[PDB]
Design an enzyme around this catalytic site. Structure first.
Site, mmCIF file in Angstrom:
data_model
loop_
_atom_site.group_PDB
_atom_site.id
_atom_site.type_symbol
_atom_site.label_atom_id
_atom_site.label_comp_id
_atom_site.label_asym_id
_atom_site.label_seq_id
_atom_site.Cartn_x
_atom_site.Cartn_y
_atom_site.Cartn_z
ATOM 1 N N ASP A 89 -1.357 5.561 -5.370
ATOM 2 C CA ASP A 89 -1.762 4.617 -4.325
ATOM 3 C C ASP A 89 -2.005 3.209 -4.876
ATOM 4 O OD1 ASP A 89 -2.608 3.340 -2.071
ATOM 5 O OD2 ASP A 89 -4.436 4.531 -1.845
ATOM 6 N N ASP A 141 0.843 -1.200 0.000
ATOM 7 C CA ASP A 141 0.000 0.000 0.000
ATOM 8 C C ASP A 141 0.875 1.247 0.000
ATOM 9 O OD1 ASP A 141 -2.198 1.741 0.172
ATOM 10 O OD2 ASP A 141 -2.240 1.685 2.329
HETATM 11 C C1 LIG Z 1 -4.103 7.264 7.851
HETATM 12 C C2 LIG Z 1 -3.503 7.860 6.609
HETATM 13 C C3 LIG Z 1 -3.367 6.864 5.477
HETATM 14 C C4 LIG Z 1 -4.676 6.554 4.884
HETATM 15 N N1 LIG Z 1 -4.588 6.287 3.477
HETATM 16 C C5 LIG Z 1 -5.664 6.021 2.749
HETATM 17 O O1 LIG Z 1 -6.788 5.952 3.233
HETATM 18 C C6 LIG Z 1 -5.443 5.765 1.272
HETATM 19 C C7 LIG Z 1 -5.892 6.984 0.495
HETATM 20 C C8 LIG Z 1 -6.180 4.508 0.806
HETATM 21 C C9 LIG Z 1 -5.411 3.228 1.118
HETATM 22 O O2 LIG Z 1 -4.531 2.932 0.032
HETATM 23 C C10 LIG Z 1 -6.349 2.047 1.453
HETATM 24 C C11 LIG Z 1 -5.599 0.778 1.892
HETATM 25 C C12 LIG Z 1 -6.535 -0.422 2.024
HETATM 26 C C13 LIG Z 1 -6.252 -1.624 1.391
HETATM 27 C C14 LIG Z 1 -7.112 -2.709 1.498
HETATM 28 C C15 LIG Z 1 -8.273 -2.607 2.238
HETATM 29 C C16 LIG Z 1 -8.573 -1.420 2.870
HETATM 30 C C17 LIG Z 1 -7.713 -0.329 2.760
HETATM 31 N N2 LIG Z 1 -7.265 1.704 0.364
HETATM 32 C C18 LIG Z 1 -8.554 2.068 0.385
HETATM 33 O O3 LIG Z 1 -9.000 2.753 1.294
HETATM 34 C C19 LIG Z 1 -9.463 1.533 -0.677
HETATM 35 C C20 LIG Z 1 -9.284 0.206 -1.047
HETATM 36 C C21 LIG Z 1 -10.164 -0.345 -1.979
HETATM 37 N N3 LIG Z 1 -10.011 -1.673 -2.423
HETATM 38 C C22 LIG Z 1 -9.168 -2.671 -1.777
HETATM 39 C C23 LIG Z 1 -8.190 -3.269 -2.775
HETATM 40 C C24 LIG Z 1 -6.970 -2.401 -2.969
HETATM 41 C C25 LIG Z 1 -6.242 -2.588 -4.313
HETATM 42 N N4 LIG Z 1 -11.191 0.339 -2.503
HETATM 43 C C26 LIG Z 1 -11.370 1.596 -2.102
HETATM 44 O O4 LIG Z 1 -12.428 2.219 -2.676
HETATM 45 C C27 LIG Z 1 -12.838 3.482 -2.139
HETATM 46 C C28 LIG Z 1 -10.554 2.249 -1.172
#
Ligand SMILES: CCCCNC(=O)[C@H](C)C[C@H](O)[C@H](Cc1ccccc1)NC(=O)c1cc(NCCCC)nc(OC)c1
Length: 375
Positions: free
Chosen positions: A218, A35
């Site tokens: 990301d 990530d």
């Molecule tokens: C505290 C400061 C840091 C916060 N940093 C974020 O919050 C970023 C913008 C974000 C992440 O990359 C998050 C990582 C993640 C991965 C797997 C599950 C949950 C969270 N990812 C998402 O939140 C996200 C993931 C997915 N799908 C999962 C598969 C990934 C290829 N879908 C989304 O759709 C809205 C959003």
């Protein structure tokens, strides 16, 4: 010699790409989502319906408790747990072992994904966004401090595995030139988009709209996510280009999927998207061109393996632009932390039809690029 790290990633854009890691003594093997949108290293450390295995602190003689709790909220999902340190290695990575911070996840909400096959997350961004605060050193910072692994890594995400080259660039994973954009600030991997074109036509928005809030790279998000105004203009332009066919408005929201008889997907009616990034030289940018095969994400139809079904992988954002996994697929992306820049090149596992091609092209001249960053 990076050959041992080629193909060290599994998974898909929909549910994440993961690398194999070991934690503790004796080593416990876990699959860890990579990530670049966060900075905490965290692993499932308690039973959960979607976890096949988890970290057992009790079984590690090298585990140390930090007597501090932690919680991380993402755009999607959140977890909380207990902070600690332990010895960590990457089997298909550099031959080294480091003591790293580890958040033992004890509770979570819509974080783990059923059938994803990963049990933890490796936040590769900078300490500025680490929880609970920036004094919790991220894994890659620990790696660089305790070993001689150079301060950079590269990601080759492949559509329908991949590679994470830790400590360098593997020239056999890409063709053509690498084009670099400066990392605007070391927190997220923040970049500046200076122009957007669809099928060669400029969106003609104030370039601050493209970075409204911020623009980040990301690997931990699937979609290209766009601020409201840009999303509406992009969807408006994409609808117009494909108007000879009907789609429900739920498709354009990523809710509903679209299908066609296998091998009859009308790719030609979906435009290419060109994102121009700030370059390394005065008044100079370069562009990356995204094919529809990237932003129309293939989804399996378990009803009848007859059609080819897809989900619209561009979604609206309220927290700035996110260049997610579908954008990184087909490109080799170099996170050159030592030089505060991110490199793009056409990947060896590039997505290609026979009429159009994903490309990284330059140089372009762009005036007042600094005025495109949001403040
Ligand atoms: C505290 C400061 C840091 C916060 N940093 C974020 O919050 C970023 C913008 C974000 C992440 O990359 C998050 C990582 C993640 C991965 C797997 C599950 C949950 C969270 N990812 C998402 O939140 C996200 C993931 C997915 N799908 C999962 C598969 C990934 C290829 N879908 C989304 O759709 C809205 C959003």
């Amino acid at each position: 010699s990076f050959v041992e790290m080629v193909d060290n990633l599994r998974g898909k854009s929909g549910q994440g790409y993961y690398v194999e890691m070991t934690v503790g003594s004796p080593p416990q093997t876990l699959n860890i989502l990579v990530d670049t949108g966060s900075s905490n290293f965290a692993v499932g450390a308690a039973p959960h319906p979607f976890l096949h295995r988890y970290y057992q602190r009790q079984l590690s003689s090298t585990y140390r408790d930090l007597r501090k709790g932690v919680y991380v909220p993402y755009t999607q999902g959140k977890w909380e747990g207990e902070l600690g340190t332990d010895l960590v290695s990457i089997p298909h990575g550099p031959n080294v072992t480091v003591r790293a911070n580890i958040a033992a996840i004890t509770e979570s909400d819509k974080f783990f994904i059923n059938g994803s096959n990963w049990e933890g997350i490796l936040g590769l961004a900078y300490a500025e966004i680490a929880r609970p605060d920036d004094s919790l050193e991220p894994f890659f910072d620990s790696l660089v401090k305790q070993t001689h692994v150079p301060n950079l890594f590269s990601l080759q995400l492949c559509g329908a595995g991949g590679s994470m080259i830790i400590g360098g660039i593997d020239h056999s994973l890409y063709t053509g030139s690498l084009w670099y954009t400066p990392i605007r600030r070391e927190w997220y991997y923040e970049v500046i988009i200076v122009r957007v074109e669809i099928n060669g036509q400029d969106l003609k928005m104030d370039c601050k709209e493209y970075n409204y809030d911020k623009s980040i790279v990301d690997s931990g998000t699937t979609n290209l996510r766009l601020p409201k105004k840009v999303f509406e203009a992009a969807v408006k332009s994409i609808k117009a280009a494909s108007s000879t066919e009907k789609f429900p408005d739920g498709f354009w929201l990523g809710e509903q999927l679209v299908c066609w008889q296998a091998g009859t997907t009308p790719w030609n009616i979906f435009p290419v998207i060109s994102l121009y990034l700030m370059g390394e030289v005065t008044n100079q940018s370069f562009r990356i061109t995204i094919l529809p095969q990237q932003y129309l994400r293939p989804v399996e139809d378990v009803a009848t393996s007859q059609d080819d079904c897809y989900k619209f992988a561009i979604s609206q954002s309220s927290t700035g632009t996110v260049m997610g996994a579908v954008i990184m697929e087909g490109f080799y992306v170099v996170f050159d932390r030592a030089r505060k820049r991110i490199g793009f090149a056409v990947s060896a596992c590039h997505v290609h039809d026979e009429f159009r091609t994903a490309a990284v092209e330059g140089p372009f001249v762009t005036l007042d690029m600094e005025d495109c960053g949001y403040n």
